[PDB]
Amino acid sequence: TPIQQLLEHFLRQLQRKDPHGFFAFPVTDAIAPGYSMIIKHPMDFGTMKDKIVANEYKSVTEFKADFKLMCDNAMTYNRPDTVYYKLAKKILHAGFKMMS
Question: Where is this region: Histone H4K5ac H4K8ac and histone H4K5bu H4K8bu binding?
Fold first, then answer.
């Protein structure tokens, strides 16, 4: 709760970095063939937004590790030459710079 306002600002800042909405909603097997076979713990901005309001983040560290989980997934699923992989590598770095 002393962190909620801060995590909301973090969330907003990070989505501003994904203007296409790539990271907005969970990825499904129909959009991304074999995804649930390859990716064990999915995560997305919309899920993170809910966790914040449900008071599920107990520390900035848990928050950050969701964001990182989300980017590691994308880098793991999508091949290095895609716009998906690249965006994930950029916003991961740029996002951790902002939160650290």
Answer: 76-78
DSSP 8-state class, residue 18: -
Q: Which technique?
A: X-ray
Answer positive or negative: Cα dihedral of 52, 58, 60, 61: negative
CATH superfamily of 1-100: Bromodomain-like (1.20.920.10)
Structure's resolution in angstroms: 2.1
Contact 18, 24 (CB under 8 A): yes
Q: d(Cα 2, Cα 98) in Å, to the nearest integer? A: 19
